[PDB]
Amino acid sequence: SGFRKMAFPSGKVEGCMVQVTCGTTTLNGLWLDDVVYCPRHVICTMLNPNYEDLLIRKSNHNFLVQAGNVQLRVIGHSMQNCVLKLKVDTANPKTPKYKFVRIQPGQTFSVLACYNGSPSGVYQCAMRPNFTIKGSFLNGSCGSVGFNIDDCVSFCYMHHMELPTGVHAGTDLEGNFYGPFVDRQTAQAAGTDTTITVNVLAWLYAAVINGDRWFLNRFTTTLNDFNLVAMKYNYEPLTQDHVDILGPLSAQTGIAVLDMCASLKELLQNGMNGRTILGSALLEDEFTPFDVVRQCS
Amino acid sequence: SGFRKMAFPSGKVEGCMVQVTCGTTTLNGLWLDDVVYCPRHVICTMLNPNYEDLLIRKSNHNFLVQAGNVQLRVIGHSMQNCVLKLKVDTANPKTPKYKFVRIQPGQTFSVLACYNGSPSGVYQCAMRPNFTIKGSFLNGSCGSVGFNIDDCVSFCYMHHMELPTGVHAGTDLEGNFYGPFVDRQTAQAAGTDTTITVNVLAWLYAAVINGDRWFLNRFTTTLNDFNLVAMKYNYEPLTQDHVDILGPLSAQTGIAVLDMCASLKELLQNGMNGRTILGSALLEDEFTPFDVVRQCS
Ligand SMILES: CC(C)(O)CCOc1cc(Cl)cc(-c2cc(-c3c[nH]c(=O)[nH]c3=O)cn(-c3cccnc3)c2=O)c1
Ligand SMILES: CC(C)(O)CCOc1cc(Cl)cc(-c2cc(-c3c[nH]c(=O)[nH]c3=O)cn(-c3cccnc3)c2=O)c1
């Protein structure tokens, strides 16, 4: 019993974190086999930088990579989109089985926050519909990575910058930003966000699995009638694919997806009336259906 | 910016988790140097067991310890309070610098949930005033450990059982239960719980550090007048030691502890009136002052 915002065990990623210094700028890098990945803005000093120019002016010896108390030698350097790739002379002996994946909004992942190549903590978050994440990051955290584990680590996020609202923007491990953001200091704000409906429904199923039933009712709704209410409350539309994804949870609890939608409609219209669900006073949308099944099963 | 329920990086503990099987019972063990620690109820089959008797009847060969895909040989076995200590023939080469600590209620720690010796996820929780924890644990999780890191891992919790309310009870790593619980199936319920006042105040300071100020006011209260309101709302008394502990956060924000207490009093008396703090609709009490400073600094 119980339901917690649970991260993946971080050991396999801890063994990959390094420090990358370029001049007076230090941030984190990800060391896999004989390559170190880090945000390319480590080469900046930049309202509007030309990274091609900045990199032409660098030599391998301008890059100091530290793995623990050991200096790695840079033997090559290239740029892929917004990531710098530093070839080093020694392969990381702790490289896990891994792949790089670009996630869809609404998907969750674990973040290993690091400073100076040293992991500080681990937490769970979601890619918001507006392609920001609500992380916890201070100066020096750039290059910290987000990931899921399946013995295979799927890296999906590298941290690059904090937006003015205090939310966070970054890239896949090929250097492509999530969202419309660019790695320079200019006026860029997150778009308006929405709530991840399928995740809220997943979390209500988690609550039932854990004995919270007070929000259930005998009514059902049509997908169309539900999505009409969703839009009024700034929730993402629910698709038939979402319904199918919730299938296993609907079967384990015996509550049809469209029956749970009638619960969610009631909750949106009347609030909780002073009650809580899994210890929360608001509707939680950063657990995926997969997250529920993993933790409740 | 941002504030998240953050766990310690789990790698140093992952390397210590093993599987302990005794007959048809399998649970998790903690392998440090040449000893494996696990809950002694692994030797049970038990409304009222006599563990001294059950252990006399065992031999080393009745204990199957598996570290990954390798069998460790048990060469000795003893019982300390409610923990079994299994001496094995090979020292764990991944043993971190570590110590065993018994924490006070209100302190937080990271849990590495494991099944069959294999880590499943990591989350943060607190020792509640009634000496239970609100964890996330399924059958087979017994022997999962709680810990803090300082390069030294301080183990503070080993999981033993789930209570009927869905909360969790266990021991320090010397086998002494937190709280009045015993490791057998009998009628034992958690005592009435209370809210950890100093932690709620810590979390309000975190909110100010992150730009939530709407709950602040110009008033101050006396420690005595505050504790009068605390008791009415089932909050732990605030002591001068708590006030002193909050010193650094009070200094960084320039808000006197007793000024923040007047905020907390208002919040207890009038609620949030539909507003949120650090993304929560209720007052959070599972961050210590130390947790705030670590994450905000
Ligand atoms: C355009 C916009 C988005 O509106 C305003 C911000 O614009 C940028 C653009 C770029 Cl290209 C980098 C950064 C940035 C740089 C650094 C950094 C600089 N120099 C170092 O030695 N080390 C660092 O870690 C840190 N953090 C940051 C701060 C807090 C949380 N997360 C990230 C940053 O956010 C910001
Ligand atoms: C007296 C009281 C507290 O009121 C009722 C419960 O009483 C006990 C007493 C003891 Cl001594 C053990 C357990 C228990 C045993 C096991 C277990 C048994 N056999 C195995 O092969 N493996 C196991 O993992 C598991 N979980 C458990 C379940 C869910 C979450 N956390 C723990 C358990 O809670 C419960």
UniProtKB/Swiss-Prot annotation, chains A, B:
Effect seen on changing residue 129 to H: In strain: Omicron/BA.1, Omicron/BA.2, Omicron/BA.2.12.1, Omicron/BA.2.75, Omicron/BA.4, Omicron/BA.5, Omicron/BQ.1.1, Omicron/XBB.1.5, Omicron/EG.5.1
Known regulation of activity: Inhibited by pyridone-containing alpha-ketoamides compounds 13a and 13b. In turn, alpha-ketoamide 13b (tert-butyl (1-((S)-1-(((S)-4-(benzylamino)-3,4-dioxo-1-((S)-2-oxopyrrolidin-3-yl)butan-2-yl)amino)-3-cyclopropyl-1-oxopropan-2-yl)-2-oxo-1,2-dihydropyridin-3-yl)carbamate) inhibits SARS-CoV-2 replication in human lung cells. Inhibited ex vivo by michael acceptor inhibitor N3. Inhibited ex vivo by compound 11a and 11b.
Localisation: Host cytoplasm; Host Golgi apparatus; Host nucleus
Catalytic reactions on record: TSAVLQ-|-SGFRK-NH2 and SGVTFQ-|-GKFKK the two peptides corresponding to the two self-cleavage sites of the SARS 3C-like proteinase are the two most reactive peptide substrates. The enzyme exhibits a strong preference for substrates containing Gln at P1 position and Leu at P2 position
Stated role: Cleaves the C-terminus of replicase polyprotein at 11 sites. Recognizes substrates containing the core sequence [ILMVF]-Q-|-[SGACN]. Cleaves and inactivates human TRMT1, preventing tRNA guanine(26)-dimethylation of tRNAs. May cleave human NLRP1 in lung epithelial cells, thereby activating the NLRP1 inflammasome pathway. May cleave human GSDMD, triggering alternative GSDME-mediated epithelial cell death upon activation of the NLRP1 inflammasome, which may enhance the release interleukins 1B, 6, 16 and 18. Also able to bind an ADP-ribose-1''-phosphate (ADRP).
Cytoplasmic side: 1-297
Gene for this chain: rep
Reported impact of residue 185 to A: Does not affect ability to cleave and inactivate human TRMT1
Assembly behavior: 3CL-PRO exists as monomer and homodimer. Only the homodimer shows catalytic activity. Interacts with host FBXO22; this interaction promotes the proteasomal degradation of nsp5.
Glycyl lysine isopeptide (Lys-Gly) (interchain with G-Cter in ubiquitin) crosslink, residue number(s): 5, 87
Residues the record marks as active site: 41, 142
Protein name: 3C-like proteinase nsp5
Domain Peptidase C30: start-end pairs: 1-297
